[PDB]
Amino acid sequence: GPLTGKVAFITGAARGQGRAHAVRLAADGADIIAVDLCDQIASVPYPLATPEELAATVKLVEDIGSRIVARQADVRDRESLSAALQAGLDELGRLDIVVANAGIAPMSAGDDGWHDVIDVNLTGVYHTIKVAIPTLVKQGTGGSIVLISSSAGLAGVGSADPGSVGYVAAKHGVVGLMRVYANLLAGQMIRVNSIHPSGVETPMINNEFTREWLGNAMPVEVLAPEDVANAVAWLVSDQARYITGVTLPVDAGFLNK
Amino acid sequence: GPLTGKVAFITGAARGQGRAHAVRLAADGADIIAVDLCDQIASVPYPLATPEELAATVKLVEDIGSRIVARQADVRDRESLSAALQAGLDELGRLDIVVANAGIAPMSAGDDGWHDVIDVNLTGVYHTIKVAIPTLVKQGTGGSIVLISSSAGLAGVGSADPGSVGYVAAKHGVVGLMRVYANLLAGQMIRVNSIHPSGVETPMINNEFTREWLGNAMPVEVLAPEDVANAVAWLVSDQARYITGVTLPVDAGFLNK
Amino acid sequence: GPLTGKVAFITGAARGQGRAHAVRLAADGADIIAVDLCDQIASVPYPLATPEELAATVKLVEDIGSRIVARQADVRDRESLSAALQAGLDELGRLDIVVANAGIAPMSAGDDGWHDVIDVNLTGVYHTIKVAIPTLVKQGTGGSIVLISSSAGLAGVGSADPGSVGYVAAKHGVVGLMRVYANLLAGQMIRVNSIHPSGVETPMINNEFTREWLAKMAAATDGAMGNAMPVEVLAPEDVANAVAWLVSDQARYITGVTLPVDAGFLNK
Amino acid sequence: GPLTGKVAFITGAARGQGRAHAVRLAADGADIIAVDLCDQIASVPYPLATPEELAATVKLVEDIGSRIVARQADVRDRESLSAALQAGLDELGRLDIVVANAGIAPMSAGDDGWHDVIDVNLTGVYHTIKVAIPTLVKQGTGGSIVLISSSAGLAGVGSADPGSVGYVAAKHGVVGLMRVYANLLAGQMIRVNSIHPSGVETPMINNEFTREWLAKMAAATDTGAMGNAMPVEVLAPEDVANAVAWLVSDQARYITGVTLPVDAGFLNK
Ligand SMILES: NC(=O)c1ccc[n+]([C@@H]2O[C@H](COP(=O)([O-])OP(=O)(O)OC[C@H]3O[C@@H](n4cnc5c(N)ncnc54)[C@H](O)[C@@H]3O)[C@@H](O)[C@H]2O)c1
Ligand SMILES: NC(=O)c1ccc[n+]([C@@H]2O[C@H](COP(=O)([O-])OP(=O)(O)OC[C@H]3O[C@@H](n4cnc5c(N)ncnc54)[C@H](O)[C@@H]3O)[C@@H](O)[C@H]2O)c1
Ligand SMILES: NC(=O)c1ccc[n+]([C@@H]2O[C@H](COP(=O)([O-])OP(=O)(O)OC[C@H]3O[C@@H](n4cnc5c(N)ncnc54)[C@H](O)[C@@H]3O)[C@@H](O)[C@H]2O)c1
Ligand SMILES: NC(=O)c1ccc[n+]([C@@H]2O[C@H](COP(=O)([O-])OP(=O)(O)OC[C@H]3O[C@@H](n4cnc5c(N)ncnc54)[C@H](O)[C@@H]3O)[C@@H](O)[C@H]2O)c1
């Protein structure tokens, strides 16, 4: 495949879009370093991933034919995340692609929702970049860093809940991370871009809370996780070698409507 | 390939990026309706394409194994452009993809440069869209319209020459066409996006005038026409089925620098 | 006032927003060079200004106490526009502020609508900038160029009509003009910015016709056409007040900006 | 003046731009609720404001002829900030204008710089909005909320230092706060906008650490890419205060959801 011999580090890889990236990039030949919390955060009113789900991602990727290192780790904890990445490096010996995908959407928790969404969705993305840079720079072969933002990183879409205004703030902060790192790493031939999905059919929105709590331009209800994985697989390939500093909506026209 | 059975209408197909689109989309299985002015505009201080160059594109596409209908046509003349497209529809029977690529960069012609760049780069893009819509809508199978803008469509980069100011104004106007047509056509599952290259190695910039007249974030001097064609080939594929309303820089970080 | 001793050149000054700029900047002490077509363009489905309306602007500004030179001129015709500007310069002796406000919204005219809206709303703005630059540069005291775009200069809001997609294209092109001229002219301390109103109560939209089309746009969309704040329409004075700030010393270092004056429409 | 009978809550009011906002809005007739940390933060290598400076802002505003309630408060501590605002509400009886101006620029502190800059410049701005909303909504007379971002809120103007990356991320996050609150509050006629200065002449820009940062950033680029477009070395605090005074006035009654550069053309360059 176009990614044979490369290694992709993916946060939130136990299910949802993170699993879709693991499967898609492995299908294209990449080996995978997969991390997920595999535990609950109290301000999040829907279940986060289980250890069983991370093991399921591992089986899918192994069946495709790639090597995979999978660790439980929390993106909020730099030492934890660094240790997990280093386990992947010890086994696979290189790093080419980073997909900073782990995220949460807390609600109905008061300001705990603000703090937790900033911590996972902004600080955790910072940590994901920071733990990867020294390897990418030392290797001297360029690479790709893909940050997962949202429509809410470019538009004021949300409710008054602290976790929702925090989600908007965090996802906007992720665009800032993208833009500064695209500038800092361009000289190293490391591309940095952000992806902005509107709604995607995953357990972040397919849950009891969201149904009880509860439009794109194209007549598309919700995107598939594969739509997001397909965009990312293009971006990290040689077909997109000179694409950097871009905010890419994958959204059936939502941001332009 | 992924585009077998589809037809792509490409303006400015005689050379440069237009040729690169014709070759890349044909390699993916598409048949081609190729048009070019194949004549000079007096305000443009470098040579435009010749009839022989359009014939050379035809040979390349036929050698790849796709069908191609090529006509001389001026994007400024709606009737000319419509007749040319119709020659292609009469032989190939359908239309799926439109690449509004023809463009000029006049200089040193005073206000004739202003007029000519608006007429080719803005009015000509409107005509390219307008003549394609009836077929796409009557078919009812969706499609893709790709408008070629520039860094100068999103940033104030230019000199005081009326042809240069006009290039900025026209390429900005192309973004506006993209945004309104993406909204107008979303219901028909017709995606509309714009591409924003910075510099590309073609005879628009590789000529005697430009040498006499006298950077990106990544250490890349100029992009290849293939870089722009690679982006477009992805956009018009099912891998980008829900991408619409986007301004996509293909620019080694120029717009983010 | 804060603009005493300065001169403002305003296109489309016979009525509407252009008249509002003339009276607002005159109230702050500016003298005025006012131009308008004062004639109809066949693709435009509502009446353009009359000669009597331009004369009425002149009286309003004289009653305020400023000097004003007014001429019938077409922004599409650089020579017409330059002659009119020069009549104003001969009388007032300087130029400080340019407001490129003339514009049209053709509809239901076929491709004549495309060509006319590009010609007035984009080429006419270019002409307005180009006739003014030499004076501003020769004086060496800086100045302000204010281009009137629209929400449709930053968003794809329009209908399936050559005049409407042309309005979007033109108003987006006006942002381009702003951005490149802000860079070209910054070294001369000439500020260049664009203003983006949503709907403003003038004869351009205060007609049966526009309300028809708004109703169809509304029905065709899944309050999409409405502002974020509960404000039905902005006053011309809202746009004139923004411009009066921008061209003052209170905004001396504001350049290269797209400024929405829109009750939150673009952010909605 | 145009703001006679109005009350403006300003964070970081002890010196710099915050003092300039207090003086400028007072000159237009407003009464002021002024808060500042009046203390140091270890990751910030230059001095923050002193209690003396806050008392000097009080003197300036009283001399202009307005009433002012000033309190020491940390925007990172929602309860502290709420208590300070309440002290001003208890005395002045209303609120019309919020200027979320307090901010820091940590550097050479490792990841403590990341955490502190997010905490002050993003979380602190959230707290400033949150403590003001109930009063604004209960009054039912509209109002203005102005968030102070930066060029670095719209462009990736930063170095690799965690405090700098964090400054870019936080200032971008402020735009997000603006956009969502403009939508949430529009129905109440409460305008929300953000201001994006480039460089402004205050201790944040002229200390030796920032100076060395600016020199390093200039040397890293091949393009005077760190300068403004107009030949203006640095903006005055009054340039930012003048823009805010306009925005909160009836001359800008329908301006909301806008990112406003005040930057001598920097972002467009
Ligand atoms: N689902 C949507 O509609 C949608 C829309 C736009 C953007 N996004 C974003 O896409 C990303 C992927 O989310 P998803 O839709 O696949 O939802 P998801 O909840 O199915 O997946 C998120 C994953 O991240 C993990 N995770 C959460 N906190 C973590 C932490 N502290 N450390 C390590 N792992 C952590 C979860 O356990 C989970 O497996 C997120 O950044 C999210 O904000 C989602
Ligand atoms: N080359 C660059 O650096 C660069 C950078 C950004 C964007 N662009 C854009 O890329 C597009 C392709 O240009 P290119 O780089 O391949 O340059 P090019 O000059 O090699 O190709 C442009 C082609 O369009 C044709 N054309 C010009 N006017 C025409 C008309 N009135 N009707 C029909 N055909 C006409 C030419 O004859 C030519 O074959 C243009 O829209 C251009 O503005 C180029
Ligand atoms: N009214 C709105 O809702 C709205 C919203 C956003 C932007 N705009 C823009 O505001 C500007 C002012 O328009 P308005 O609302 O006051 O409408 P208006 O029709 O009342 O005023 C426009 C004026 O320009 C004149 N004019 C038109 N073409 C001309 C030409 N070729 N040369 C010289 N003068 C010409 C008219 O005769 C008229 O007096 C325009 O650029 C318009 O596109 C209007
Ligand atoms: N100076 C520039 O060039 C520049 C450029 C763009 C944006 N900004 C921003 O302008 C705003 C004002 O900064 P300034 O230039 O006046 O600098 P400054 O350092 O002179 O003023 C900042 C003030 O905020 C206070 N403050 C800091 N942390 C606090 C906290 N936790 N709680 C309460 N008060 C706190 C300080 O003590 C001080 O009085 C900041 O948001 C800053 O990021 C500054």
Author numbering:
A (entry chain C), B (entry chain B): 7 to 220, 234 to 276
C (entry chain A): 7 to 228, 231 to 276
D (entry chain D): 7 to 229, 231 to 276
The authors write:
Here we present a series of TIGR03971 SDR crystal structures from several mycobacterial species which contain an insertion in the primary sequence at the NAD cofactor binding site. These crystal structures demonstrate that the inserted protein residues almost completely cover the NAD cofactor, only leaving part of the nicotinamide ring exposed to solvent. NMR experiments did not show exchange of the NAD cofactor, whereas binding was demonstrated for a number of small molecules which could be potential substrates, products, inhibitors, or artificial redox partners. Experimental results are consistent with the notion that the SDR family enzymes linked by comparative genomics studies to mycofactocin do indeed keep their NAD tightly bound beneath a protein structure that may interact with a specialized adaptor machinery for redox exchange.
With the exception of the M. thermoresistibile target which did not contain NAD, all other mycobacterial SDR target crystal structures contained NAD, which appears to have co-purified with the protein after expression in E. coli. For each of these crystal structures, the adenosine mononucleotide portion of the cofactor binding site is enveloped by the inserted residues and only a portion of the nicotinamide ring appears open to solvent (see representative examples in Fig. 2A and B). In addition to the insertion loop which covers the adenosine portion of the cofactor, a second loop which typically contains two α-helices covers much of nicotinamide mononucleotide portion of the cofactor. In contrast, this loop is ordered in each of the mycobacterial SDR crystal structures presented here. The combination of the insertion loop which covers the adenosine portion of the cofactor and the ordering of the second loop which covers the nicotinamide mononucleotide portion of the cofactor results in a significant decrease in the solvent accessible surface area of the cofactor in the mycobacterial SDRs, relative to other NAD- and NADP-dependent dehydrogenases. Only a small portion of the nicotinamide ring appears available to solvent in each of these cases, indicating that the NAD cofactor is tightly bound and potentially non-exchangeable. The structures presented here have a cofactor solvent accessible surface area of approximately 18 Å2, whereas other NAD- or NADP-bound dehydrogenases have a cofactor solvent accessible surface area of 82–89 Å2. Given the encapsulation of the NAD cofactor by the two loops in mycobacterial SDRs, a large conformational change would be required to release the NADH cofactor after a redox reaction had occurred. Alternatively, these structural elements may not allow for exchange of bound NAD/NADH with free NAD/NADH.
